Amino acid sequence: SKLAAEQSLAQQPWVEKYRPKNLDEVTAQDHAVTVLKKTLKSANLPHMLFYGPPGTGKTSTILALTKELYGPDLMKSRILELNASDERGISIVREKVKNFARLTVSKPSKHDLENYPCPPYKIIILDEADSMTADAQSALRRTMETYSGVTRFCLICNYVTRIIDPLASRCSKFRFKALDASNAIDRLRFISEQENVKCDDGVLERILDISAGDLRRGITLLQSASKGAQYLGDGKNITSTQVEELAGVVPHDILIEIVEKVKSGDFDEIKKYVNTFMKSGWSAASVVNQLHEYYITNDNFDTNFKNQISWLLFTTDSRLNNGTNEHIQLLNLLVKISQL
Amino acid sequence: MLEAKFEEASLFKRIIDGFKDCVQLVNFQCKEDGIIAQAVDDSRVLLVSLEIGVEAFQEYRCDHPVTLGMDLTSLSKILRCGNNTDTLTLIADNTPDSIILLFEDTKKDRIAEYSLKLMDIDADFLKIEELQYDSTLSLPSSEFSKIVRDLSQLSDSINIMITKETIKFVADGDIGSGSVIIKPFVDMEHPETSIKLEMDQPVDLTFGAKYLLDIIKGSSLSDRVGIRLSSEAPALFQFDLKSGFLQFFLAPKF
Amino acid sequence: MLEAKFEEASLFKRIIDGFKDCVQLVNFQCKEDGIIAQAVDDSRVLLVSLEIGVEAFQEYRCDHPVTLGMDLTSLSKILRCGNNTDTLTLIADNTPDSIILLFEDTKKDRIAEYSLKLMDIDADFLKIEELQYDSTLSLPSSEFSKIVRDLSQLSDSINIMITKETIKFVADGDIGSGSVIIKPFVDMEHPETSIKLEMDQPVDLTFGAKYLLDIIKGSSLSDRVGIRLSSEAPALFQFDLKSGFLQFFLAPKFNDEE
Amino acid sequence: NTWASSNKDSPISWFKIVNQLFRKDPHRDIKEQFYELLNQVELNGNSDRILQGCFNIFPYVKYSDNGIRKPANISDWLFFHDLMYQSMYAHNGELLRYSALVPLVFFQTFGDIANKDDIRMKNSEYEQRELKRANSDIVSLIMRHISVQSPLMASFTDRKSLIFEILPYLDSMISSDFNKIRNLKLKQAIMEELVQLLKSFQLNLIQNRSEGFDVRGGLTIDPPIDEVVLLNPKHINEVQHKRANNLSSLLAKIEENR
Amino acid sequence: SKENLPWVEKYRPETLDEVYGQNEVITTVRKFVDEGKLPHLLFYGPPGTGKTSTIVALAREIYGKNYSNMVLELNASDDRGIDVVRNQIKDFASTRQIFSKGFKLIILDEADAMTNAAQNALRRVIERYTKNTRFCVLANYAHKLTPALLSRCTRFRFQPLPQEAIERRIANVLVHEKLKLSPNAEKALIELSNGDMRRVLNVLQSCKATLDNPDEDEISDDVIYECCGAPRPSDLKAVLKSILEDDWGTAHYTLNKVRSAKGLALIDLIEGIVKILEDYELQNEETRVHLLTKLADIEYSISKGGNDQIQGSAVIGAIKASFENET
Amino acid sequence: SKLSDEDVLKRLLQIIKLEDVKYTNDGLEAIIFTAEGDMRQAINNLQSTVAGHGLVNADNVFKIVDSPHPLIVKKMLLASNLEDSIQILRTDLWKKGYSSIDIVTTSFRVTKNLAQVKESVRLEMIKEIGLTHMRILEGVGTYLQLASMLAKIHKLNNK
Amino acid sequence: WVDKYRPKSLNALSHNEELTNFLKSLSDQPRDLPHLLLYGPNGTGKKTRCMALLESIFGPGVYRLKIDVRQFVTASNRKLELNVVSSPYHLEITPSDMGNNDRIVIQELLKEVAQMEHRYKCVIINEANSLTKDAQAALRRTMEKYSKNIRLIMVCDSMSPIIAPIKSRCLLIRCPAPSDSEISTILSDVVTNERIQLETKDILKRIAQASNGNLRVSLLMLESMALNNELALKSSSPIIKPDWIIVIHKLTRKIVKERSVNSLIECRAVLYDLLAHCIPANIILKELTFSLLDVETLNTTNKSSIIEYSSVFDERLSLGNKAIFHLEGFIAKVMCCL
DNA sequence: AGCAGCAACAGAGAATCT
Numbered sequence A: 001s002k003l004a005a006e007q008s009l010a011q012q013p014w015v016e017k018y019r020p021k022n023l024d025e026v027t028a029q030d031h032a033v034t035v036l037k038k039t040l041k042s043a044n045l046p047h048m049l050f051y052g053p054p055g056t057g058k059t060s061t062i063l064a065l066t067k068e069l070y071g072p073d074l075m076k077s078r079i080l081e082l083n084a085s086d087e088r089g090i091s092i093v094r095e096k097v098k099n100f101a102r103l104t105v106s107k108p109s110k111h112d113l114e115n116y117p118c119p120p121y122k123i124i125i126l127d128e129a130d131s132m133t134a135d136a137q138s139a140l141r142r143t144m145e146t147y148s149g150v151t152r153f154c155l156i157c158n159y160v161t162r163i164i165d166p167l168a169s170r171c172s173k174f175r176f177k178a179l180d181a182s183n184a185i186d187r188l189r190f191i192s193e194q195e196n197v198k199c200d201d202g203v204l205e206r207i208l209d210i211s212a213g214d215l216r217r218g219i220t221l222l223q224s225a226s227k228g229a230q231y232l233g234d235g236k237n238i239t240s241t242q243v244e245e246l247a248g249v250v251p252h253d254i255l256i257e258i259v260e261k262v263k264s265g266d267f268d269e270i271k272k273y274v275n276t277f278m279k280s281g282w283s284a285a286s287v288v289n290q291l292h293e294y295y296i297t298n299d300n301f302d303t304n305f306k307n308q309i310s311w312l313l314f315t316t317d318s319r320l321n322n323g324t325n326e327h328i329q330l331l332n333l334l335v336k337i338s339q340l
Numbered sequence B: 001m002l003e004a005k006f007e008e009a010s011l012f013k014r015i016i017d018g019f020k021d022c023v024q025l026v027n028f029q030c031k032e033d034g035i036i037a038q039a040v041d042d043s044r045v046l047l048v049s050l051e052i053g054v055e056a057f058q059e060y061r062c063d064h065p066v067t068l069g070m071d072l073t074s075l076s077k078i079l080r081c082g083n084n085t086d087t088l089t090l091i092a093d094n095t096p097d098s099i100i101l102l103f104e105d106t107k108k109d110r111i112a113e114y115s116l117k118l119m120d121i122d123a124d125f126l127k128i129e130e131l132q133y134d135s136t137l138s139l140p141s142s143e144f145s146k147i148v149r150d151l152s153q154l155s156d157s158i159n160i161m162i163t164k165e166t167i168k169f170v171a172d173g174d175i176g177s178g179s180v181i182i183k184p185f186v187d188m189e190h191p192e193t194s195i196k197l198e199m200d201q202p203v204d205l206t207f208g209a210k211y212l213l214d215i216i217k218g219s220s221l222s223d224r225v226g227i228r229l230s231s232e233a234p235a236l237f238q239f240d241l242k243s244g245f246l247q248f249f250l251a252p253k254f
Numbered sequence C: 001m002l003e004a005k006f007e008e009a010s011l012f013k014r015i016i017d018g019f020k021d022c023v024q025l026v027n028f029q030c031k032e033d034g035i036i037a038q039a040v041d042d043s044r045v046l047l048v049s050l051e052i053g054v055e056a057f058q059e060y061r062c063d064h065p066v067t068l069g070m071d072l073t074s075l076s077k078i079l080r081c082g083n084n085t086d087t088l089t090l091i092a093d094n095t096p097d098s099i100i101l102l103f104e105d106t107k108k109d110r111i112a113e114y115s116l117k118l119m120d121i122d123a124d125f126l127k128i129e130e131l132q133y134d135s136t137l138s139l140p141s142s143e144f145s146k147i148v149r150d151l152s153q154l155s156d157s158i159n160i161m162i163t164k165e166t167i168k169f170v171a172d173g174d175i176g177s178g179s180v181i182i183k184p185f186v187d188m189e190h191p192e193t194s195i196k197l198e199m200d201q202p203v204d205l206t207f208g209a210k211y212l213l214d215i216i217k218g219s220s221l222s223d224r225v226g227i228r229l230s231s232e233a234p235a236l237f238q239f240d241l242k243s244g245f246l247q248f249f250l251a252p253k254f255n256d257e258e
Numbered sequence D: 001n002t003w004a005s006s007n008k009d010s011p012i013s014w015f016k017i018v019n020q021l022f023r024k025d026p027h028r029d030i031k032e033q034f035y036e037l038l039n040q041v042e043l044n045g046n047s048d049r050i051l052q053g054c055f056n057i058f059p060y061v062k063y064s065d066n067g068i069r070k071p072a073n074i075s076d077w078l079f080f081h082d083l084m085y086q087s088m089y090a091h092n093g094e095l096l097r098y099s100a101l102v103p104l105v106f107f108q109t110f111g112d113i114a115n116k117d118d119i120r121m122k123n124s125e126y127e128q129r130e131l132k133r134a135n136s137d138i139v140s141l142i143m144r145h146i147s148v149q150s151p152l153m154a155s156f157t158d159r160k161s162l163i164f165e166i167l168p169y170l171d172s173m174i175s176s177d178f179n180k181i182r183n184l185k186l187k188q189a190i191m192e193e194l195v196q197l198l199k200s201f202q203l204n205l206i207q208n209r210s211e212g213f214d215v216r217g218g219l220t221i222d223p224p225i226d227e228v229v230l231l232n233p234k235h236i237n238e239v240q241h242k243r244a245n246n247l248s249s250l251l252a253k254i255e256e257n258r
Numbered sequence E: 001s002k003e004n005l006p007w008v009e010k011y012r013p014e015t016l017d018e019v020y021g022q023n024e025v026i027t028t029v030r031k032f033v034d035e036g037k038l039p040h041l042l043f044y045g046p047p048g049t050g051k052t053s054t055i056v057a058l059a060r061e062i063y064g065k066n067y068s069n070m071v072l073e074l075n076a077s078d079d080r081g082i083d084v085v086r087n088q089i090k091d092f093a094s095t096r097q098i099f100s101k102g103f104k105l106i107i108l109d110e111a112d113a114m115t116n117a118a119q120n121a122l123r124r125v126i127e128r129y130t131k132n133t134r135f136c137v138l139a140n141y142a143h144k145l146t147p148a149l150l151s152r153c154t155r156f157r158f159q160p161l162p163q164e165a166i167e168r169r170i171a172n173v174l175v176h177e178k179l180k181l182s183p184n185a186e187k188a189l190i191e192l193s194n195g196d197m198r199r200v201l202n203v204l205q206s207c208k209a210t211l212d213n214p215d216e217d218e219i220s221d222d223v224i225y226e227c228c229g230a231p232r233p234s235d236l237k238a239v240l241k242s243i244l245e246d247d248w249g250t251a252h253y254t255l256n257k258v259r260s261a262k263g264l265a266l267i268d269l270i271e272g273i274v275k276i277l278e279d280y281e282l283q284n285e286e287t288r289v290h291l292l293t294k295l296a297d298i299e300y301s302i303s304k305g306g307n308d309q310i311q312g313s314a315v316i317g318a319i320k321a322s323f324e325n326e327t
Numbered sequence F: 001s002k003l004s005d006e007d008v009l010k011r012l013l014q015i016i017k018l019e020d021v022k023y024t025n026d027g028l029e030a031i032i033f034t035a036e037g038d039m040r041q042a043i044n045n046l047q048s049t050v051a052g053h054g055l056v057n058a059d060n061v062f063k064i065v066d067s068p069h070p071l072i073v074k075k076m077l078l079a080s081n082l083e084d085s086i087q088i089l090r091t092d093l094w095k096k097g098y099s100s101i102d103i104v105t106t107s108f109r110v111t112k113n114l115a116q117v118k119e120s121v122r123l124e125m126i127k128e129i130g131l132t133h134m135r136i137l138e139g140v141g142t143y144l145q146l147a148s149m150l151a152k153i154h155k156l157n158n159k
Numbered sequence G: 001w002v003d004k005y006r007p008k009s010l011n012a013l014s015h016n017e018e019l020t021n022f023l024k025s026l027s028d029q030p031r032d033l034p035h036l037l038l039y040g041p042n043g044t045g046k047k048t049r050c051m052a053l054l055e056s057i058f059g060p061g062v063y064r065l066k067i068d069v070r071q072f073v074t075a076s077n078r079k080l081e082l083n084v085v086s087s088p089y090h091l092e093i094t095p096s097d098m099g100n101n102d103r104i105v106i107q108e109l110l111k112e113v114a115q116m117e118h119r120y121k122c123v124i125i126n127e128a129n130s131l132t133k134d135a136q137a138a139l140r141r142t143m144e145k146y147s148k149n150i151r152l153i154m155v156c157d158s159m160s161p162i163i164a165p166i167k168s169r170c171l172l173i174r175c176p177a178p179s180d181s182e183i184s185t186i187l188s189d190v191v192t193n194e195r196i197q198l199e200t201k202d203i204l205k206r207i208a209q210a211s212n213g214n215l216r217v218s219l220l221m222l223e224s225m226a227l228n229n230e231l232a233l234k235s236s237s238p239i240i241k242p243d244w245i246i247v248i249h250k251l252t253r254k255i256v257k258e259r260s261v262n263s264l265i266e267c268r269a270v271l272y273d274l275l276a277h278c279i280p281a282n283i284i285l286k287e288l289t290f291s292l293l294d295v296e297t298l299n300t301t302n303k304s305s306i307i308e309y310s311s312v313f314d315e316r317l318s319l320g321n322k323a324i325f326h327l328e329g330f331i332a333k334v335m336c337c338l
Numbered sequence H: 001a002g003c004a005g006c007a008a009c010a011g012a013g014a015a016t017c018t
């Protein structure tokens, strides 16, 4: 029963092993969980719309809230979870969602009311609402407007612009903030201590620095570093270099070579060095980000050069965000910034 | 709580057959003097109203009224397990999320039990029945069904006209026109075939054939049908049960 | 060669009604001790297996086994000419390209004869039946059909659970849940209505309702149905014939497996 | 000569609109001509077919040429149309109003008084789409064959790598002139390796005997790799003559091995 | 009980006197209903302006407490096709009421999602049955309605809620709830609303939940800004000043520390800087052209994701290069 | 064809004579202006104004029946300076509750049907009005996108 | 041949020793293994390394696999036909074998495999770049809901089209192309095992210099030129180039030689003939641009404009579906530039 | 690469007649 769950969690990757089960495990998204804890004692949970960067804990927060609300018994009877792996057209929204909303709430047991608040409403959550078409979204308007007495709607998305304006107005907007080093160092250190991850001083803070506001990727990188340090068995501590090696970060010397080729060099030398660099597998997004950090941070370039480098890096990132060829985009970016 | 046992599951199945198709949601309410149920179609031209007194049941217990709404389609889907001769017991607590239908054969043998999910419907029972109607008539329901089935083919509207000692059903459409004229008469050879008519005022109303077709289903519950018409309100077609009745109120076409 | 004459074309028509819909290709084989036939559906969760002994026929002659495969749909299309009371003779040479169905009325009058094109199917008859099953039960087939028809409306999965002296069928889906509980009992007033149960081990298996619905068709061949369940193999639903039987082996759902 | 009733009730064949989009009348205001053409494109509702017509016609049209930039500006519109057409399947068709503007850019850019003759047109795209489908189906069948035989090759073969790298080399190996090899042992070893490669890719040598009275039934590879690899019509004829002698030698070796 | 509904649903207006903001249309509709001549209405407006509440209160005032039976209310949640029209709407219009005597009301809420064939079939239902029933079409976009259907109804445009009406509703809510609100906090709340009562009610409930107290204290600007995650005008103007005057590295550091100290979003800062720079009296419009173009491009890129640091540097560089033409 | 000003004016005068309504010349002019050759819409607006205020005056007609939507959009697009167009878009359209989709779509119609400017500049303005539409259909519909569209249209008109 | 000499375990790898050690570290504890995404240049050997890692997570029977078929129904009864590579320990799906119906196959098949279930069954998604955004969104939650029964190993050549949620939901492993020295050492073992005659060893190095890190292309070209030299490579053996590369080179020669509309027609014809023979348009554009930059007749001003137009039209092609509509536009823009 | 609206065909169930 519970022991099987404990063992399955212990044999699970750290992303799912340390998933927040209660509203207190949320480390940084405090403004939302404060309201969620206050409404736990009341019974006026409004329709909610979670939006923010990926890996901020929206799904974990709503799961912990539904748990703390309904208990592990009513967790499976008063919840309608619809993900992006299911059909969510107009037909589905009109039939299934509306039939579940029109239905009455299931009767709680005697053990439920003694430990959990058991609100008189159920919860219908729609994860990854970006893939929902606007007509199927507008179909949900009156469905969530008239049956609010018996069901509550929780939308979850990454881009709040993909959801129509009426739905965004009907739901309370909860913006999840990026999890940088400051507001996630406590959670990362807790995960490291619970797994006996022996690292150096500036490793964890560096990991989140590579994560760029993503605790899931940071936990995955920490698990990979711990596995790589346990395989060696040397008993030493994990270093920031070993972490940034497996995180896809280009070494500093290879980036300085690119800066030298951009500063001094013609089209042919730059093209040859780019062709050689693309042989070693590096993500073009990470290279663009590192070049942006170096160029904007270095206090040795003119402001007129800085405006142009910022606009060129922005254009290159916007083009790379569409599935383009990394080699062509990187070469074009380096050539354009070399003419400056 | 709800605790109503029908001697034969068949009675309940025929009653629900009456709500079937023409309405989607039904609101039931059990109480000390029996069970009532109301359902209104989407266009709001038809109201189906049921009343089953305590005596229609083999066992009925109610110390606390319960109101429950449900999807009829879901109900009928489940309403073909009665074997007709099976015993049927409707069961529900005072604050139900479901309605339990329990079919059992005489012997302990086979027990089919269902737990139907309920819908929340704002309780708002209508009381549109009139004290007096312009005209009142009853006739065999199979005869009424034939009359409706005849005329239906000709038009989407069937007119009912009443004058002293004369009842006339008329349809007129594309292929032509038709009419069925019946006269009041007492048959002593068996009065269940008689045709009674009490007219206080001549009436002439038109109804949508699609609705009259839904209404004729009540023939399966009673030998006779009562029709009450008025120029001031929806018409009433009524099918009596032993301790109870199934009523259809239909708004005339403007 | 194949030479099998059924007294009443009706028996063969009901047998084929059993393969109907749930399978497309059937592999028949006639031999010295009778006729057998096997058909497996595309998803391979259902096997339909037939056995008709020599005594089920009015005339049967076989000096050389013949295996023949055919499209079930084509066969049923032709299987409504039997008048039920007509006599039916299945005929085929030792290396057939077709199967001949010959329906004749008592008198020389109407003779309907068909020549059905055969399909080539790699002969590979399965022998998946078990020595012992966890539990065995039989009950009137019309009762089993009702039980299946009830529950089917509620879900695409119907669970069969067996414990000492208790058989329980359960379905649970969107609109709610349902269950039919039956108990073993001997009716001397007519034992064809009794419900027998021999349990060596409690069982609890789930089947896809669409398949159980295909299986209930066997009611038309026998008054009773035998159900044998095991946690180690496909379940067996069997409908006995006079000298023979129609068997349906159905693989339990793993969690999602018909 | 019947056309009066057509002018009375029928619109402008999309072909007639395409030829009108490349024509400028010197005697009418360019704005009036533009609004007349806009109304004709909107009334037709088939902006896509008109644009595909414009795309096939523009290379053959006479247009005062400075550096063929006009074509560069029109590639950006055409790309705008393709994005708009993709969005029509994702979004409610409000964007359909802008579809009529893209054909009118051809009138602005390429409309000339020189274009007095009607250029007839065809549908290369439907033929290219059907050919791309047929080639994709052949490639999908080869990829399935590799998955069944080569347990590991299938993990390293993408559809693109198979078309551009593997199949052209495989065909060059089969089409190689074995008549230049004087060493019989080396010829036999290469033929044994080629038989192993034909087996790994499941390439069957079929004798096409569809030859009317002419005494050389050509050997063909099934699936026909030739239709996917051989883009150049000159190389097709050279390769076909070389392959015919190689395939007969390979068939004889496959039969020897069988 | 009504204490379980959210504040957006709990405070839904039930009478026409509780619908604030709309005065010219509310008075005209009241006069239409009192004098009797109520034509086919077309309530066009943005979400959260009070069209559905207005028509519900109107039907309540017309038919009484039995509104839910004498009115046919169809919306996008219900199947609205051409056959649905043909059967349901025509049978409702042709027949009469089963509860009383009087004209009927068909409320086609959110009718901007109806099919063109449905509107083409309904435009002759509105014109044929016009002596015993009326039609009310609610819309957010007037381009999804055919011009034929658009011409048969009297159009009423629901303007966004002004300051006076939204403050009146806020005062009503603060009377109904044991809650106090600061004046500057109220002004900041009105600023982040754009005339949407739903947002105001939602964030008011959320900041009441944020209070963490038995509500013996007040709600200040800090509570609102920390609960809605919206940037403050102080940090907004500080970032704008550091971008316009200070150095590139210093501007980058200022933007980073501002967006990381309160967890602010780059899109909110972009919109705030756009709103602030709209009042700037500038030179030749080339700077405004470049600024608007680059800011809209960066916003459209943010709407699809990417690197937040790269986009922030892009915003800084775009604003700087746009203002470099003003000299 | 469309009904000229004289015919609709004559029909409205006949209706007023048959109904004994108090009116004025400027009120009838505003009614006909907001009708745009639509006799049914003209009679509907007249009846609505009568039942809402009693006197058919231009002030009442304008306060009950907002001015034609396409005309303000045309005046916004035909603006000579960027600040004037921005102020028009802010006050007349955005501050009155007009959705961005209606603004951009009405904008497309106005341009397509424009005749003051040449064909090439009209096509470029239609092209710019399109990107703003694509961005608004993707859910990025805000005031900044319309401002950028107007800026790009002015840059095209800026030679 | 490439297939006759291929490593089957982690100890059989012969390049990127740090990557082999990282894979051994990741396979030391196989049950607490997150999802993996192998990215890098095409032809590096990531599909062999994933199978070698599976050979360490499970028994040697991972390579004994079979090809089955599964049918699917979209809205139409159209039975999307998809073949599946299955093994008693893992299964491989390639959603790049169909059109916009990747989401259906992904969701249904993965849900069936996850509901049926060392303890988990591995899933290899081949060519994850062809996965549409809707299919990736559908897989986003399937990756997290079933993490104790299904582990994904997605093989791709560039994480550019992969969405950020999927990137975060799995570990990222880069596979850098092997150095020319390692390629030469591998070709040496191959030619000593296949009994090839090398007059001078340096030719092998040149093969690497003609493959650009690609081992799959290197071995195939070595074997193709070994058949032309009759199993005896000389000091000046010609380099065997694919046909499409020669067509692209001739196209660039035509481009730099003539810049007109009459030549644009034959350029469109060549593009049609290339696209009709199962050649992707992105690779065509990449090779065309890279070989146009190699033209010594042009200057830096021409090459910069060429690379800018190629990036623009690559974005266009990634946003469009009619590939020739963008290819012809890029060719016309290059003609206008020169 | 939805939906919808459709319309047509096939299958199942119910009723009537022999």
Ligand SMILES: Nc1ncnc2c1ncn2[C@@H]1O[C@H](COP(=O)(O)OP(=O)(O)OP(O)(O)=S)[C@@H](O)[C@H]1O
Residues within 6 Å of the ligand: A014, A015, A016, A018, A019, A020, A025, A026, A027, A028, A029, A053, A054, A055, A056, A057, A058, A059, A060, A061, A157, A158, A187, A215, A216, A219, G144, G165
């Ligand atoms: N605030 C947080 N506190 C603790 N752990 C967190 C937090 N946010 C994310 N995580 C970890 O990251 C895992 C993923 O959480 P999710 O809620 O799925 O992230 P996400 O916001 O849903 O990203 P998506 O699904 O791509 S939008 C959790 O199981 C935790 O292990």
Ligand SMILES: Nc1ncnc2c1ncn2[C@@H]1O[C@H](COP(=O)(O)OP(=O)(O)OP(O)(O)=S)[C@@H](O)[C@H]1O
Residues within 6 Å of the ligand: A166, A169, E007, E008, E009, E011, E012, E013, E018, E019, E020, E021, E022, E046, E047, E048, E049, E050, E051, E052, E053, E054, E139, E140, E161, E169, E197, E198, E201
């Ligand atoms: N004028 C108003 N006065 C008071 N409360 C209002 C007003 N407008 C909106 N509200 C509040 O906002 C809630 C929603 O109003 P609705 O009428 O549903 O919005 P809407 O105008 O119909 O826009 P939609 O539904 O998105 S098209 C109401 O229940 C009220 O609580």
Ligand SMILES: Nc1ncnc2c1ncn2[C@@H]1O[C@H](COP(=O)(O)OP(=O)(O)O)[C@@H](O)[C@H]1O
Residues within 6 Å of the ligand: D155, D156, D157, G002, G003, G005, G006, G007, G012, G013, G014, G015, G042, G043, G044, G045, G046, G047, G048, G049, G186, G214, G215, G216, G217, G219
């Ligand atoms: N460790 C290795 N040592 C030697 N050759 C290898 C090794 N791994 C892969 N190869 C070979 O190098 C080439 C790499 O191409 P391919 O296998 O298609 O790459 P991928 O595995 O990424 O699909 C193939 O010939 C492959 O067999």
Ligand SMILES: [Mg+2]
Residues within 6 Å of the ligand: A058, A059, A127, A128, A156
């Ligand atoms: Mg999530």
Ligand SMILES: [Mg+2]
Residues within 6 Å of the ligand: E051, E052, E109, E110, E138
């Ligand atoms: Mg509304």
